């Protein structure tokens, strides 16, 4: 008395195992719980998350234009920040700035958007005429 | 000073035969614990997911942040299926 800590731990481990069995990584389950604590995070990912990633993308694009964001970049920032929307947007625009800076020649922007922030997929596709 | 942390190892396959106790400083970071479990128990930190209470731990924070206070405080180490 009283280590309900172990109860909460077992609960999260349960949801993490269930997520892993459905292809969801623990960061997805935990990010779902931390951003509006849905009692089912598996339903929440498919159900409520798309508009939230769209939110990260809209705020991120509005913050430091022009450097549009892809859904994959917003998702990666969102998961990398365990669901913290402001941190997610900041890391999103920060990582995209890193990716346009990383390119050898361009500035171009369409290539990174079109290939979900993949530096070398946008690099290989933008080598065209 | 050091405290007895009650790590319960959890895996994709698991029901409680394997428990572990680790002396850790609450002021030490979760990353430091990850390196400790790497050398001690042989688990690479890339596969380690620490759960303390209702939190999937971030390696930058201290165990006290979640938080490790008394001895015997329970933690869970979920290992990923590489």
From Swiss-Prot, chain A:
> What tissue expression does the UniProt record report for this protein?
Expressed in both normal and transformed breast epithelial cell lines.
Region called Interaction with RBCK1, residue ranges: 83-129
UniProt subcellular location? Cytoplasm
The family annotation for this protein states: Belongs to the RBR family.
Complex and partners? Component of the LUBAC complex (linear ubiquitin chain assembly complex) which consists of SHARPIN, RBCK1 and RNF31. LUBAC has a MW of approximately 600 kDa suggesting a heteromultimeric assembly of its subunits. Associates with the TNF-R1 signaling complex (TNF-RSC) in a stimulation-dependent manner. Interacts (via the PUB domain) with OTULIN (via the PIM motif); the interaction is direct. Interacts (via the PUB domain) with VCP (via the PIM motif). Interacts (via the PUB domain) with SPATA2 (via the PIM motif); interaction is direct and bridges RNF31 and CYLD.
Q: Which disease is it linked to?
A: Immunodeficiency 115 with autoinflammation: An autosomal recessive immunologic disorder manifesting in early infancy and characterized by combined immunodeficiency, recurrent bacterial, viral, and fungal infections, as well as autoinflammatory features, including arthritis and dermatitis.
What does it do? E3 ubiquitin-protein ligase component of the LUBAC complex which conjugates linear ('Met-1'-linked) polyubiquitin chains to substrates and plays a key role in NF-kappa-B activation and regulation of inflammation. LUBAC conjugates linear polyubiquitin to IKBKG and RIPK1 and is involved in activation of the canonical NF-kappa-B and the JNK signaling pathways. Linear ubiquitination mediated by the LUBAC complex interferes with TNF-induced cell death and thereby prevents inflammation.
Name of protein = E3 ubiquitin-protein ligase RNF31
- Please give the organism: Homo sapiens
* Range of the intact protein held here: 480 to 615 of 1072
From Swiss-Prot, chain B:
Q: Which organism is it from?
A: Homo sapiens
Question: Which part of the full protein is shown?
Answer: 217 to 302 of 387
The domain-related comment in the record is: The Ubiquitin-like domain is required for the interaction with RNF31.
Q: Where is this region: Interaction with SHANK1?
A: 1-82
Q: Where in the cell is it found?
A: Cytoplasm, Cytosol; Synapse
Q: Which disease is it linked to?
A: Autoinflammation with episodic fever and immune dysregulation: An autosomal recessive disorder characterized by recurrent fever and autoinflammation with onset in infancy or early childhood. Variable clinical manifestations include lymphadenopathy, hepatosplenomegaly, gastrointestinal inflammation, polyarthritis and joint inflammation, parotitis, and immune dysregulation.
Q: How does it assemble?
A: Monomer and homodimer. Component of the LUBAC complex (linear ubiquitin chain assembly complex) which consists of SHARPIN, RBCK1 and RNF31. LUBAC has a MW of approximately 600 kDa suggesting a heteromultimeric assembly of its subunits. Associates with the TNF-R1 signaling complex (TNF-RSC) in a stimulation-dependent manner. Interacts with EYA1, EYA2, SHANK1 and SHANK3 (via ANK repeats).
Q: Which residues form the Ubiquitin-like domain?
A: 3-68
Name of this protein: Sharpin
- UniProt note on tissues of expression: Highly expressed in skeletal muscle and placenta and at lower levels in brain, heart, colon without mucosa, thymus, spleen, kidney, liver, small intestine, lung and peripheral blood leukocytes. Up-regulated in various tumor tissues such as kidney, liver, ovary and pancreas tumors.
* Described purpose of this protein according to its UniProt entry: Component of the LUBAC complex which conjugates linear polyubiquitin chains in a head-to-tail manner to substrates and plays a key role in NF-kappa-B activation and regulation of inflammation. LUBAC conjugates linear polyubiquitin to IKBKG and RIPK1 and is involved in activation of the canonical NF-kappa-B and the JNK signaling pathways. Linear ubiquitination mediated by the LUBAC complex interferes with TNF-induced cell death and thereby prevents inflammation.
